[PDB]
PDB file of C-alpha atoms and ligand atoms in Angstrom:
ATOM      1  CA  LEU A   1       1.675  -7.389  20.847  1.00 42.77           C
ATOM      2  CA  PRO A   2       4.652  -5.001  20.442  1.00 41.50           C
ATOM      3  CA  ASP A   3       4.316  -1.287  21.151  1.00 41.31           C
ATOM      4  CA  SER A   4       6.163  -0.218  18.045  1.00 43.46           C
ATOM      5  CA  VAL A   5       6.997  -1.872  14.788  1.00 41.60           C
ATOM      6  CA  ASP A   6       8.789  -0.567  11.707  1.00 41.74           C
ATOM      7  CA  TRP A   7       9.280  -3.014   8.859  1.00 41.48           C
ATOM      8  CA  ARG A   8      11.854  -0.774   7.173  1.00 42.78           C
ATOM      9  CA  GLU A   9      14.141  -1.843  10.028  1.00 44.12           C
ATOM     10  CA  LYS A  10      13.942  -5.465   8.825  1.00 43.14           C
ATOM     11  CA  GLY A  11      14.739  -4.464   5.204  1.00 44.45           C
ATOM     12  CA  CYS A  12      11.219  -5.387   4.028  1.00 44.92           C
ATOM     13  CA  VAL A  13      10.307  -2.054   2.427  1.00 43.71           C
ATOM     14  CA  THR A  14      11.652  -0.845  -0.895  1.00 45.92           C
ATOM     15  CA  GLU A  15      12.517   2.715  -1.753  1.00 46.54           C
ATOM     16  CA  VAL A  16       9.775   5.270  -1.927  1.00 48.13           C
ATOM     17  CA  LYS A  17       8.175   5.635  -5.339  1.00 49.74           C
ATOM     18  CA  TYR A  18       6.762   8.586  -7.227  1.00 49.13           C
ATOM     19  CA  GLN A  19       3.393   8.090  -8.916  1.00 46.45           C
ATOM     20  CA  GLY A  20       3.139  11.560 -10.487  1.00 50.18           C
ATOM     21  CA  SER A  21       0.067  12.408 -12.622  1.00 53.61           C
ATOM     22  CA  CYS A  22      -1.151   8.791 -12.917  1.00 54.00           C
ATOM     23  CA  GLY A  23      -3.651   7.753 -10.201  1.00 52.79           C
ATOM     24  CA  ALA A  24      -1.915   4.410  -9.539  1.00 53.53           C
ATOM     25  CA  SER A  25      -1.555   4.752  -5.755  1.00 55.65           C
ATOM     26  CA  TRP A  26      -3.547   1.455  -5.495  1.00 56.03           C
ATOM     27  CA  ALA A  27      -0.923  -0.366  -7.541  1.00 57.88           C
ATOM     28  CA  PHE A  28       1.877   1.087  -5.414  1.00 57.86           C
ATOM     29  CA  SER A  29       0.077  -0.007  -2.240  1.00 57.06           C
ATOM     30  CA  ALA A  30      -0.340  -3.513  -3.709  1.00 57.40           C
ATOM     31  CA  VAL A  31       3.265  -4.035  -4.768  1.00 55.95           C
ATOM     32  CA  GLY A  32       4.441  -2.597  -1.404  1.00 60.27           C
ATOM     33  CA  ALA A  33       2.550  -5.230   0.538  1.00 59.72           C
ATOM     34  CA  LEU A  34       3.783  -8.118  -1.686  1.00 59.01           C
ATOM     35  CA  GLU A  35       7.442  -6.879  -1.795  1.00 58.65           C
ATOM     36  CA  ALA A  36       7.497  -7.420   1.975  1.00 55.27           C
ATOM     37  CA  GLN A  37       6.153 -11.004   1.793  1.00 56.33           C
ATOM     38  CA  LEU A  38       8.696 -11.796  -0.934  1.00 56.01           C
ATOM     39  CA  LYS A  39      11.479 -10.561   1.372  1.00 56.90           C
ATOM     40  CA  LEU A  40      10.236 -12.611   4.309  1.00 58.66           C
ATOM     41  CA  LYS A  41       9.877 -15.715   2.082  1.00 55.93           C
ATOM     42  CA  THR A  42      13.110 -15.371   0.064  1.00 53.15           C
ATOM     43  CA  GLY A  43      15.456 -12.906   1.792  1.00 54.28           C
ATOM     44  CA  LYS A  44      15.563 -10.847  -1.442  1.00 56.41           C
ATOM     45  CA  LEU A  45      13.975  -7.411  -1.501  1.00 55.70           C
ATOM     46  CA  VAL A  46      12.875  -6.608  -5.069  1.00 57.41           C
ATOM     47  CA  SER A  47      10.609  -3.755  -6.260  1.00 59.04           C
ATOM     48  CA  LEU A  48       7.684  -5.260  -8.110  1.00 58.46           C
ATOM     49  CA  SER A  49       6.012  -3.644 -11.056  1.00 55.25           C
ATOM     50  CA  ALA A  50       3.173  -1.177 -10.575  1.00 51.90           C
ATOM     51  CA  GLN A  51       3.044  -0.599 -14.344  1.00 46.19           C
ATOM     52  CA  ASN A  52       2.321  -4.312 -14.765  1.00 44.55           C
ATOM     53  CA  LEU A  53      -0.742  -3.881 -12.517  1.00 46.04           C
ATOM     54  CA  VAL A  54      -1.812  -0.677 -14.231  1.00 47.15           C
ATOM     55  CA  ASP A  55      -1.528  -2.216 -17.723  1.00 49.05           C
ATOM     56  CA  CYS A  56      -2.846  -5.740 -16.974  1.00 48.21           C
ATOM     57  CA  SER A  57      -5.177  -5.585 -13.927  1.00 47.77           C
ATOM     58  CA  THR A  58      -7.840  -3.650 -15.796  1.00 46.58           C
ATOM     59  CA  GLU A  59     -11.685  -3.667 -16.252  1.00 46.42           C
ATOM     60  CA  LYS A  60     -11.969  -7.441 -15.643  1.00 46.38           C
ATOM     61  CA  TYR A  61     -10.656  -6.644 -12.070  1.00 44.82           C
ATOM     62  CA  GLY A  62     -12.683  -3.446 -11.676  1.00 44.60           C
ATOM     63  CA  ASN A  63      -9.627  -1.238 -12.244  1.00 44.02           C
ATOM     64  CA  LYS A  64      -9.063   1.721 -14.539  1.00 42.37           C
ATOM     65  CA  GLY A  65      -5.246   2.047 -14.534  1.00 41.55           C
ATOM     66  CA  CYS A  66      -4.359   5.758 -14.053  1.00 41.07           C
ATOM     67  CA  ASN A  67      -8.024   6.529 -13.319  1.00 42.66           C
ATOM     68  CA  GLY A  68      -7.972   4.340 -10.173  1.00 44.68           C
ATOM     69  CA  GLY A  69      -8.386   0.816  -8.910  1.00 42.03           C
ATOM     70  CA  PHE A  70      -8.169  -1.348  -5.825  1.00 42.52           C
ATOM     71  CA  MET A  71      -5.404  -3.364  -4.093  1.00 43.04           C
ATOM     72  CA  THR A  72      -7.649  -6.400  -3.415  1.00 46.44           C
ATOM     73  CA  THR A  73      -8.323  -6.962  -7.129  1.00 46.04           C
ATOM     74  CA  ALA A  74      -4.670  -6.288  -7.976  1.00 47.13           C
ATOM     75  CA  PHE A  75      -3.746  -9.139  -5.654  1.00 49.43           C
ATOM     76  CA  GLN A  76      -6.300 -11.342  -7.433  1.00 48.94           C
ATOM     77  CA  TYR A  77      -4.740 -10.564 -10.847  1.00 48.34           C
ATOM     78  CA  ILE A  78      -1.342 -11.725  -9.568  1.00 46.70           C
ATOM     79  CA  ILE A  79      -2.912 -14.944  -8.296  1.00 49.25           C
ATOM     80  CA  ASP A  80      -4.722 -15.393 -11.673  1.00 47.93           C
ATOM     81  CA  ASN A  81      -1.733 -14.306 -13.841  1.00 49.81           C
ATOM     82  CA  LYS A  82       0.434 -16.780 -11.771  1.00 51.90           C
ATOM     83  CA  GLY A  83       3.078 -14.064 -11.533  1.00 52.00           C
ATOM     84  CA  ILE A  84       4.094 -10.427 -11.470  1.00 54.54           C
ATOM     85  CA  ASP A  85       7.130  -8.852 -13.115  1.00 53.79           C
ATOM     86  CA  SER A  86       9.939  -6.976 -11.436  1.00 53.12           C
ATOM     87  CA  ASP A  87       9.974  -3.184 -11.614  1.00 52.27           C
ATOM     88  CA  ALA A  88      13.404  -3.408 -13.256  1.00 50.23           C
ATOM     89  CA  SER A  89      11.960  -5.437 -16.162  1.00 48.61           C
ATOM     90  CA  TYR A  90       8.627  -3.600 -16.427  1.00 52.59           C
ATOM     91  CA  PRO A  91       9.364   0.007 -15.374  1.00 53.44           C
ATOM     92  CA  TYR A  92       6.770   2.561 -14.222  1.00 53.99           C
ATOM     93  CA  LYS A  93       5.776   5.045 -16.965  1.00 55.09           C
ATOM     94  CA  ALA A  94       2.891   6.955 -15.259  1.00 56.58           C
ATOM     95  CA  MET A  95       0.564   6.237 -18.202  1.00 59.90           C
ATOM     96  CA  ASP A  96      -1.783   3.487 -19.339  1.00 55.55           C
ATOM     97  CA  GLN A  97      -0.196   1.062 -21.859  1.00 52.13           C
ATOM     98  CA  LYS A  98      -0.958  -2.259 -23.557  1.00 51.73           C
ATOM     99  CA  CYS A  99      -0.300  -5.241 -21.233  1.00 49.58           C
ATOM    100  CA  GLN A 100       3.352  -6.271 -21.654  1.00 48.56           C
ATOM    101  CA  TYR A 101       3.724  -8.963 -18.984  1.00 48.53           C
ATOM    102  CA  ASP A 102       6.380 -11.576 -19.724  1.00 50.13           C
ATOM    103  CA  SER A 103       6.639 -14.619 -17.427  1.00 49.34           C
ATOM    104  CA  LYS A 104      10.411 -14.849 -18.147  1.00 46.80           C
ATOM    105  CA  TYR A 105      10.787 -11.773 -15.869  1.00 46.82           C
ATOM    106  CA  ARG A 106       8.412 -12.943 -13.099  1.00 48.46           C
ATOM    107  CA  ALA A 107       9.795 -11.721  -9.777  1.00 49.11           C
ATOM    108  CA  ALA A 108       7.018 -12.794  -7.415  1.00 50.76           C
ATOM    109  CA  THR A 109       3.864 -14.751  -7.015  1.00 49.13           C
ATOM    110  CA  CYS A 110       0.763 -14.523  -4.817  1.00 48.04           C
ATOM    111  CA  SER A 111      -1.184 -17.433  -3.267  1.00 48.54           C
ATOM    112  CA  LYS A 112      -3.958 -15.592  -1.377  1.00 48.57           C
ATOM    113  CA  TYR A 113      -4.959 -12.243   0.159  1.00 52.12           C
ATOM    114  CA  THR A 114      -6.942 -11.266   3.289  1.00 50.21           C
ATOM    115  CA  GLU A 115      -9.236  -8.314   3.960  1.00 52.07           C
ATOM    116  CA  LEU A 116      -9.513  -6.979   7.496  1.00 51.47           C
ATOM    117  CA  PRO A 117     -12.767  -5.830   9.126  1.00 48.65           C
ATOM    118  CA  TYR A 118     -13.662  -2.194   8.458  1.00 51.05           C
ATOM    119  CA  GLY A 119     -12.647   0.348  11.137  1.00 51.34           C
ATOM    120  CA  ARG A 120     -10.883  -2.166  13.416  1.00 48.77           C
ATOM    121  CA  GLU A 121      -7.619  -0.474  14.427  1.00 46.09           C
ATOM    122  CA  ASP A 122      -6.835  -3.189  16.981  1.00 44.92           C
ATOM    123  CA  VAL A 123      -7.100  -5.786  14.179  1.00 45.71           C
ATOM    124  CA  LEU A 124      -4.955  -3.723  11.791  1.00 48.27           C
ATOM    125  CA  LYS A 125      -2.298  -3.396  14.523  1.00 47.42           C
ATOM    126  CA  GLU A 126      -2.304  -7.171  15.073  1.00 46.83           C
ATOM    127  CA  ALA A 127      -1.867  -7.799  11.309  1.00 47.27           C
ATOM    128  CA  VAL A 128       0.940  -5.237  10.969  1.00 46.34           C
ATOM    129  CA  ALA A 129       2.749  -6.774  13.949  1.00 42.00           C
ATOM    130  CA  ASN A 130       2.121 -10.462  13.034  1.00 41.57           C
ATOM    131  CA  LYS A 131       1.926 -10.542   9.217  1.00 43.66           C
ATOM    132  CA  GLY A 132       3.899  -7.620   7.702  1.00 43.63           C
ATOM    133  CA  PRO A 133       2.983  -4.345   5.991  1.00 43.38           C
ATOM    134  CA  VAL A 134      -0.722  -3.906   5.077  1.00 44.30           C
ATOM    135  CA  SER A 135      -2.235  -2.186   2.035  1.00 43.90           C
ATOM    136  CA  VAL A 136      -4.832   0.451   3.011  1.00 45.26           C
ATOM    137  CA  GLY A 137      -6.730   3.344   1.565  1.00 42.26           C
ATOM    138  CA  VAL A 138      -6.876   6.798   3.099  1.00 41.36           C
ATOM    139  CA  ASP A 139      -8.862   9.970   2.581  1.00 43.03           C
ATOM    140  CA  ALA A 140      -6.159  12.194   1.117  1.00 44.59           C
ATOM    141  CA  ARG A 141      -8.510  14.814  -0.463  1.00 43.43           C
ATOM    142  CA  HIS A 142      -7.458  17.620   1.925  1.00 44.09           C
ATOM    143  CA  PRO A 143      -4.902  20.373   1.482  1.00 46.40           C
ATOM    144  CA  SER A 144      -3.276  19.536   4.860  1.00 45.12           C
ATOM    145  CA  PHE A 145      -2.396  16.102   3.480  1.00 44.21           C
ATOM    146  CA  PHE A 146      -0.427  17.437   0.485  1.00 42.38           C
ATOM    147  CA  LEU A 147       1.294  20.056   2.724  1.00 40.22           C
ATOM    148  CA  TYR A 148       2.253  17.563   5.425  1.00 42.86           C
ATOM    149  CA  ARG A 149       5.967  17.720   6.221  1.00 42.99           C
ATOM    150  CA  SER A 150       6.361  16.070   9.646  1.00 43.13           C
ATOM    151  CA  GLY A 151       4.828  14.963  12.955  1.00 44.48           C
ATOM    152  CA  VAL A 152       1.604  13.044  13.532  1.00 44.86           C
ATOM    153  CA  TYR A 153      -0.981  13.983  10.912  1.00 41.45           C
ATOM    154  CA  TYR A 154      -4.445  14.886  12.173  1.00 42.98           C
ATOM    155  CA  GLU A 155      -7.117  16.591  10.031  1.00 46.92           C
ATOM    156  CA  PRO A 156     -10.363  17.479  11.824  1.00 44.74           C
ATOM    157  CA  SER A 157     -12.307  17.423   8.515  1.00 46.43           C
ATOM    158  CA  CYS A 158     -11.018  13.960   7.390  1.00 48.92           C
ATOM    159  CA  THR A 159     -13.606  11.306   6.473  1.00 48.70           C
ATOM    160  CA  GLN A 160     -13.702   7.517   6.174  1.00 49.59           C
ATOM    161  CA  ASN A 161     -14.291   7.673   2.384  1.00 50.85           C
ATOM    162  CA  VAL A 162     -10.876   6.552   1.179  1.00 51.20           C
ATOM    163  CA  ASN A 163      -9.485   7.501  -2.209  1.00 51.09           C
ATOM    164  CA  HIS A 164      -5.672   7.052  -2.139  1.00 51.44           C
ATOM    165  CA  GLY A 165      -3.702   3.817  -1.716  1.00 51.61           C
ATOM    166  CA  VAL A 166      -0.804   3.599   0.715  1.00 51.93           C
ATOM    167  CA  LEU A 167       1.222   1.057   2.738  1.00 52.64           C
ATOM    168  CA  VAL A 168       1.165   0.733   6.544  1.00 51.65           C
ATOM    169  CA  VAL A 169       4.710  -0.381   7.418  1.00 52.33           C
ATOM    170  CA  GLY A 170       4.560   0.197  11.187  1.00 50.38           C
ATOM    171  CA  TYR A 171       3.002   1.933  14.123  1.00 50.49           C
ATOM    172  CA  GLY A 172       4.108   3.611  17.314  1.00 50.55           C
ATOM    173  CA  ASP A 173       3.721   6.491  19.726  1.00 48.43           C
ATOM    174  CA  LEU A 174       5.584   9.801  19.551  1.00 47.17           C
ATOM    175  CA  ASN A 175       5.318  12.086  22.582  1.00 48.54           C
ATOM    176  CA  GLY A 176       1.918  10.728  23.622  1.00 48.03           C
ATOM    177  CA  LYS A 177       0.515  10.655  20.044  1.00 45.91           C
ATOM    178  CA  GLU A 178      -0.186   7.131  18.738  1.00 42.09           C
ATOM    179  CA  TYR A 179       0.453   6.826  15.005  1.00 38.96           C
ATOM    180  CA  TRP A 180       0.546   4.537  12.013  1.00 35.88           C
ATOM    181  CA  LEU A 181       3.707   4.643   9.890  1.00 35.85           C
ATOM    182  CA  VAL A 182       2.625   5.024   6.252  1.00 33.83           C
ATOM    183  CA  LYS A 183       4.739   4.753   3.131  1.00 32.98           C
ATOM    184  CA  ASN A 184       3.241   6.989   0.405  1.00 34.62           C
ATOM    185  CA  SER A 185       3.938   7.035  -3.350  1.00 36.17           C
ATOM    186  CA  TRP A 186       4.742  10.764  -3.819  1.00 36.82           C
ATOM    187  CA  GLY A 187       8.529  10.465  -3.714  1.00 36.66           C
ATOM    188  CA  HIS A 188      11.027  11.418  -1.023  1.00 35.66           C
ATOM    189  CA  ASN A 189      10.170  15.139  -0.976  1.00 38.32           C
ATOM    190  CA  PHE A 190       6.708  14.370   0.468  1.00 34.30           C
ATOM    191  CA  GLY A 191       6.425  14.304   4.285  1.00 35.09           C
ATOM    192  CA  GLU A 192       9.121  12.496   6.301  1.00 37.88           C
ATOM    193  CA  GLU A 193      11.409  11.099   3.567  1.00 37.06           C
ATOM    194  CA  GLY A 194       8.264   9.957   1.696  1.00 37.59           C
ATOM    195  CA  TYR A 195       6.397   8.770   4.833  1.00 36.80           C
ATOM    196  CA  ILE A 196       3.512  10.102   6.836  1.00 37.93           C
ATOM    197  CA  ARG A 197       2.705   9.308  10.440  1.00 37.34           C
ATOM    198  CA  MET A 198      -1.017   9.316  10.958  1.00 38.42           C
ATOM    199  CA  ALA A 199      -3.248   9.439  13.989  1.00 39.13           C
ATOM    200  CA  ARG A 200      -3.947   5.983  15.410  1.00 40.14           C
ATOM    201  CA  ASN A 201      -6.843   4.999  17.696  1.00 40.87           C
ATOM    202  CA  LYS A 202      -8.656   8.252  16.796  1.00 42.99           C
ATOM    203  CA  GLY A 203     -11.842   6.666  15.464  1.00 45.60           C
ATOM    204  CA  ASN A 204     -10.605   5.342  12.115  1.00 47.14           C
ATOM    205  CA  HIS A 205      -8.984   8.646  11.233  1.00 43.76           C
ATOM    206  CA  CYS A 206      -8.962   9.273   7.467  1.00 44.25           C
ATOM    207  CA  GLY A 207     -10.363   5.759   7.026  1.00 44.09           C
ATOM    208  CA  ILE A 208      -6.900   4.158   7.403  1.00 44.16           C
ATOM    209  CA  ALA A 209      -8.581   0.967   8.680  1.00 46.29           C
ATOM    210  CA  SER A 210     -11.609   1.141   6.302  1.00 46.16           C
ATOM    211  CA  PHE A 211     -10.248  -1.302   3.675  1.00 48.49           C
ATOM    212  CA  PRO A 212      -7.061  -3.049   4.727  1.00 49.95           C
ATOM    213  CA  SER A 213      -5.748  -6.046   2.886  1.00 52.56           C
ATOM    214  CA  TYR A 214      -2.567  -8.070   2.529  1.00 50.44           C
ATOM    215  CA  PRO A 215      -1.144 -10.836   0.336  1.00 48.14           C
ATOM    216  CA  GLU A 216       0.612 -14.091   1.283  1.00 49.81           C
ATOM    217  CA  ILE A 217       3.099 -16.136  -0.673  1.00 53.65           C
ATOM    218  CA  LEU A 218       2.825 -19.769   0.379  1.00 48.12           C
ATOM    219  CA  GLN A 219       5.064 -22.892   0.103  1.00 46.46           C
TER     220      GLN A 219
HETATM  221  C1  B8J B 301     -15.702  -5.336 -11.834  1.00 46.83           C
HETATM  222  N1  B8J B 301     -15.374  -5.580 -10.415  1.00 46.83           N
HETATM  223  C2  B8J B 301     -15.578  -4.655  -9.390  1.00 46.83           C
HETATM  224  O1  B8J B 301     -16.040  -3.532  -9.495  1.00 46.83           O
HETATM  225  N2  B8J B 301     -15.152  -5.273  -8.223  1.00 46.83           N
HETATM  226  C3  B8J B 301     -15.214  -4.540  -6.913  1.00 46.83           C
HETATM  227  C4  B8J B 301     -13.869  -3.840  -6.645  1.00 46.83           C
HETATM  228  C5  B8J B 301     -13.810  -3.302  -5.227  1.00 46.83           C
HETATM  229  N3  B8J B 301     -15.153  -3.217  -4.653  1.00 46.83           N
HETATM  230  C6  B8J B 301     -15.269  -2.292  -3.492  1.00 46.83           C
HETATM  231  C7  B8J B 301     -14.439  -2.664  -2.288  1.00 46.83           C
HETATM  232  C8  B8J B 301     -14.780  -1.765  -1.123  1.00 46.83           C
HETATM  233  N4  B8J B 301     -14.239  -0.426  -1.262  1.00 46.83           N
HETATM  234  N5  B8J B 301     -12.911  -0.279  -1.538  1.00 46.83           N
HETATM  235  C9  B8J B 301     -12.733   1.057  -1.600  1.00 46.83           C
HETATM  236  C10 B8J B 301     -11.415   1.569  -1.896  1.00 46.83           C
HETATM  237  C11 B8J B 301     -10.274   0.859  -1.503  1.00 46.83           C
HETATM  238  C12 B8J B 301      -9.010   1.339  -1.796  1.00 46.83           C
HETATM  239  C13 B8J B 301      -8.848   2.536  -2.497  1.00 46.83           C
HETATM  240  C14 B8J B 301      -7.475   3.049  -2.799  1.00 46.83           C
HETATM  241  F1  B8J B 301      -6.842   2.364  -3.745  1.00 46.83           F
HETATM  242  F2  B8J B 301      -7.463   4.345  -3.157  1.00 46.83           F
HETATM  243  F3  B8J B 301      -6.696   2.934  -1.780  1.00 46.83           F
HETATM  244  C15 B8J B 301      -9.989   3.245  -2.891  1.00 46.83           C
HETATM  245  C16 B8J B 301     -11.253   2.767  -2.600  1.00 46.83           C
HETATM  246  C17 B8J B 301     -13.952   1.743  -1.376  1.00 46.83           C
HETATM  247  C18 B8J B 301     -14.869   0.781  -1.157  1.00 46.83           C
HETATM  248  C19 B8J B 301     -16.326   1.061  -0.863  1.00 46.83           C
HETATM  249  C20 B8J B 301     -16.549   2.593  -0.691  1.00 46.83           C
HETATM  250  N6  B8J B 301     -15.308   3.265  -0.236  1.00 46.83           N
HETATM  251  C21 B8J B 301     -14.967   3.832   0.944  1.00 46.83           C
HETATM  252  O2  B8J B 301     -13.856   4.307   1.131  1.00 46.83           O
HETATM  253  C22 B8J B 301     -15.916   3.904   2.112  1.00 46.83           C
HETATM  254  C23 B8J B 301     -16.627   2.899   2.693  1.00 46.83           C
HETATM  255  N7  B8J B 301     -17.313   3.462   3.730  1.00 46.83           N
HETATM  256  C24 B8J B 301     -16.997   4.755   3.758  1.00 46.83           C
HETATM  257  N8  B8J B 301     -16.143   5.074   2.800  1.00 46.83           N
HETATM  258  C25 B8J B 301     -14.328   3.179  -1.311  1.00 46.83           C
HETATM  259  C26 B8J B 301     -15.684  -4.572  -4.429  1.00 46.83           C
HETATM  260  C27 B8J B 301     -15.644  -5.401  -5.716  1.00 46.83           C
HETATM  261  C28 B8J B 301     -14.676  -6.576  -8.521  1.00 46.83           C
HETATM  262  C29 B8J B 301     -14.142  -7.601  -7.726  1.00 46.83           C
HETATM  263  C30 B8J B 301     -13.767  -8.797  -8.337  1.00 46.83           C
HETATM  264  C31 B8J B 301     -13.920  -8.974  -9.712  1.00 46.83           C
HETATM  265  C32 B8J B 301     -14.452  -7.950 -10.512  1.00 46.83           C
HETATM  266  C33 B8J B 301     -14.826  -6.755  -9.900  1.00 46.83           C
END
């Protein structure tokens, strides 16, 4: 297994997004993970629609749009819906709306998804190295998280009760500190150009490896 990866370097990560007041971090984590698989499969990097997930992957998938939801069930919707629209065709509005999915603008598809075992940072590392970026949840309910600007994030009072969806797009070590490279959905002004490096191999720090999952686009 490699010592560092960074999927941005293989043009598999889209630009950082800005969720704003709507609690759709889950949807941004989901589309992030699938964007990468679409690139690998097709060579084309296209931002997929979070608003589509918010509007259409709803109570039938255990989701509540701007009030929260899960990546796993988002991935199921895309399997069930037999498609997801492009961001360009179904733009993010940071509010709940009627479902406006149109298969004419389908930009990707999803065949299956996998969940990783809880708390297994060795397994998460393997998946990130061998499969692509991985959707995870983190415990982001801490002032130090919102105020993070750079370096390797470590919060002594972090828990493994995750509440905020993000994308693991790499890992590495910086000056002795092992980290995971995490794309967030708070725009470019957050952290390191929209990214946060987070403590790795520090006992499932902030629950980063509590609920990982990733999609696959077959055939
Ligand atoms: C109607 N209907 C549902 O309801 N389902 C459920 C939706 C998700 N469930 C829970 C998954 C586990 N699970 N997933 C998160 C989770 C994942 C990601 C995020 C975020 F998006 F923010 F990233 C937030 C929470 C948390 C947990 C358990 C407790 N949690 C912890 O963090 C924790 C565990 N040990 C210490 N702490 C939160 C299982 C089924 C349905 C599934 C199919 C069809 C219809 C369905």
